[PDB]
Scaffold this active site. Structure first.
Site, PDB file in Angstrom:
ATOM      1  N   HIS A 183       1.666   1.275  -5.659  1.00 52.86           N
ATOM      2  CA  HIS A 183      -0.159   0.792  -5.761  1.00 52.86           C
ATOM      3  C   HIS A 183      -1.108   2.403  -6.161  1.00 52.86           C
ATOM      4  CE1 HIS A 183      -3.913  -0.796  -4.461  1.00 52.86           C
ATOM      5  NE2 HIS A 183      -3.371   0.132  -3.670  1.00 52.86           N
ATOM      6  N   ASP A 233      -8.659  -0.726  -7.813  1.00 55.61           N
ATOM      7  CA  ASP A 233      -8.550  -1.270  -7.116  1.00 55.61           C
ATOM      8  C   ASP A 233      -7.604  -2.452  -6.602  1.00 55.61           C
ATOM      9  OD1 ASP A 233      -6.716  -0.273  -3.920  1.00 55.61           O
ATOM     10  OD2 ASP A 233      -8.794  -1.659  -3.076  1.00 55.61           O
ATOM     11  N   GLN A 287      -6.784 -17.666  -3.497  1.00 57.84           N
ATOM     12  CA  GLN A 287      -6.767 -17.069  -5.222  1.00 57.84           C
ATOM     13  C   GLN A 287      -7.622 -17.363  -5.782  1.00 57.84           C
ATOM     14  OE1 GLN A 287      -4.637 -14.155  -6.233  1.00 57.84           O
ATOM     15  NE2 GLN A 287      -4.625 -13.947  -3.769  1.00 57.84           N
ATOM     16  N   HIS A 294       1.234  -0.996   0.075  1.00 55.44           N
ATOM     17  CA  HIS A 294      -0.022   0.233  -0.164  1.00 55.44           C
ATOM     18  C   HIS A 294       1.020   1.160  -0.029  1.00 55.44           C
ATOM     19  CE1 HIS A 294      -3.121  -2.476   1.380  1.00 55.44           C
ATOM     20  NE2 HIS A 294      -3.902  -2.190   0.585  1.00 55.44           N
ATOM     21  N   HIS A 304      -5.721   7.295  -2.685  1.00 57.86           N
ATOM     22  CA  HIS A 304      -7.645   5.965  -2.046  1.00 57.86           C
ATOM     23  C   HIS A 304      -6.526   5.943  -1.154  1.00 57.86           C
ATOM     24  CE1 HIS A 304      -5.699   3.151  -4.202  1.00 57.86           C
ATOM     25  NE2 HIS A 304      -6.355   2.608  -3.866  1.00 57.86           N
ATOM     26  N   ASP A 305      -5.181   5.672  -0.665  1.00 59.56           N
ATOM     27  CA  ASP A 305      -4.726   4.892  -0.054  1.00 59.56           C
ATOM     28  C   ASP A 305      -3.453   5.607   0.995  1.00 59.56           C
ATOM     29  OD1 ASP A 305      -5.422   2.106   0.633  1.00 59.56           O
ATOM     30  OD2 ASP A 305      -4.944   1.429  -1.208  1.00 59.56           O
TER      31      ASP A 305
HETATM   32  C1  LIG Z   1      -3.539 -11.262  -4.711  1.00 61.00           C
HETATM   33  C2  LIG Z   1      -4.686 -10.600  -5.150  1.00 61.00           C
HETATM   34  N1  LIG Z   1      -5.613 -10.685  -3.584  1.00 61.00           N
HETATM   35  N2  LIG Z   1      -6.066 -11.375  -2.581  1.00 61.00           N
HETATM   36  C3  LIG Z   1      -6.846 -11.101  -2.008  1.00 61.00           C
HETATM   37  C4  LIG Z   1      -6.582 -12.342  -0.987  1.00 61.00           C
HETATM   38  C5  LIG Z   1      -6.756  -9.867  -0.930  1.00 61.00           C
HETATM   39  C6  LIG Z   1      -7.971 -10.313   0.243  1.00 61.00           C
HETATM   40  C7  LIG Z   1      -8.302  -8.807   0.498  1.00 61.00           C
HETATM   41  C8  LIG Z   1      -8.185  -7.711  -0.102  1.00 61.00           C
HETATM   42  C9  LIG Z   1      -7.483  -7.392  -1.716  1.00 61.00           C
HETATM   43  C10 LIG Z   1      -5.974  -8.708  -2.195  1.00 61.00           C
HETATM   44  C11 LIG Z   1      -6.242  -9.018  -3.467  1.00 61.00           C
HETATM   45  O1  LIG Z   1      -5.764  -7.860  -4.684  1.00 61.00           O
HETATM   46 MG   LIG Z   2      -6.900   0.646   1.011  1.00 55.76          MG
HETATM   47 ZN   LIG Z   3      -5.832   1.112  -2.892  1.00 58.85          ZN
END
Ligand SMILES: CCn1nc(C)c2ccccc2c1=O
Ligand SMILES: [Mg+2]
Ligand SMILES: [Zn+2]
Length: 324
Positions: free
Chosen positions: A83, A228, A280, A79, A117-118
């Site tokens: 990103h 995102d 995944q 983050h 956003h982050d």
């Molecule tokens: C690796 C892809 N991924 N994989 C997971 C598990 C995930 C969980 C909560 C928020 C975002 C994510 C995400 O971007």
């Molecule tokens: Mg965020």
């Molecule tokens: Zn983000």
């Protein structure tokens, strides 16, 4: 409080020219900003000028903003600044492919909301801050970090020579901040599930109307999630590398929970790396595929995001079967 950039930082950005070979590259949804670090602040200026025009923002103010925004990102594994620009790029590709569906005020609001956003992320999830009574969770009950990211956005705009929206009318400035606020909040994954479910129902019944503001807000929300989560829309080798960063940040949060005698969820457990391909598969099935499927239905030109996500789902299925 928000950190300010140096005169050297913003002045170096003013002089930046994007190489011509990349102008065609940045237009593609699969574009990976990864190999052009020095160019990321310049890539954002380029995207803003192509989508909103060179007259939209005062060059010095825009350069001060970008560079101060860059400074207010922490050196966390995922983050971070990289990103921010990655999410902003995906928004640019969506907006460019759907230009007339969004207003000049929405396009400038969304690109700014995506880079911000982050802001000031600490590498901790909302649940973690709430569970361990962190001061941010006391100040913000729901969507904890997202409310903090919008607070940080407002703070940078209120710095000297940073108000890139000062030249808007009082009604337009108010409108732009509301766009930014709803867009940042929408990046809280917990809100996505309900938002996408509402959008599905509206699309299937044929009641979805982009003239209706509440509908528009929901469509903007899904665009936010789509940007995102865009690492799932890159070419396989980029998608794998970004997953490493996502998990490195998750495992550090899990380590903090273990230090406090709390076992983390397998996702944040570095001793549970073997569970990642199934995690995944679950994430693509219930989060990413539904997101990009609804997005492509609402905005048909966003189809390449669903196509790439489906290809990455195929690769994760290949990992599970023993073809990695
Ligand atoms: C690796 C892809 N991924 N994989 C997971 C598990 C995930 C969980 C909560 C928020 C975002 C994510 C995400 O971007
Ligand atoms: Mg965020
Ligand atoms: Zn983000």
């Amino acid at each position: 409080n928000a950190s300010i950039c140096t005169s050297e930082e913003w002045q170096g950005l003013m002089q930046f020219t994007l190489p011509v070979r990349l102008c065609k590259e940045i237009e593609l949804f699969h574009f990976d900003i990864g190999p052009f670090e020095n160019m990321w602040p310049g890539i954002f200026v380029y995207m803003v000028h192509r989508s909103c025009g060179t007259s939209c923002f005062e060059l010095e103010k825009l350069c001060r903003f970008i560079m101060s925004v860059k400074k207010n990102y922490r050196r966390v594994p995922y983050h971070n600044w990289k990103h921010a620009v990655t999410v902003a790029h995906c928004m640019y590709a969506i907006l460019q492919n759907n230009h007339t569906l969004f207003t000049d005020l929405e396009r400038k609001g969304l690109l700014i909301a995506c880079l911000c956003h982050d802001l000031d992320h600490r590498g901790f999830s909302n649940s973690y801050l709430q569970k361990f009574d962190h001061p941010l969770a006391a100040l913000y009950s729901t969507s904890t970090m997202e409310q903090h990211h919008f607070s940080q956005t407002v703070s940078i705009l209120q710095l000297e020579g940073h108000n890139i929206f000062s030249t808007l009318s009082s009604s337009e400035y108010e409108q732009v901040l509301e766009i930014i606020r709803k867009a940042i909040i929408a990046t809280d994954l917990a809100l996505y599930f309900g938002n996408r479910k509402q959008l599905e129902e509206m699309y299937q019944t044929g009641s979805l109307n982009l003239n209706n503001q509440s509908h528009r807000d929901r469509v903007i929300g899904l665009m936010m999630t789509a940007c995102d989560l865009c690492s799932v829309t890159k070419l396989w080798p980029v998608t794998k590398l970004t997953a490493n960063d996502i998990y490195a940040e998750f495992w550090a949060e899990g380590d903090e929970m273990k230090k406090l005698g709390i076992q983390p969820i397998p996702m944040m457990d570095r001793d549970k790396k073997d569970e990642v391909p199934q995690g995944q598969l679950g994430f693509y099935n219930a989060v990413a595929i539904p997101c990009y499927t609804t997005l492509t239905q609402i905005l048909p030109p966003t189809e390449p995001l669903l196509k790439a996500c489906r290809d990455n789902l195929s690769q994760w299925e290949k990992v599970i079967r023993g073809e990695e």
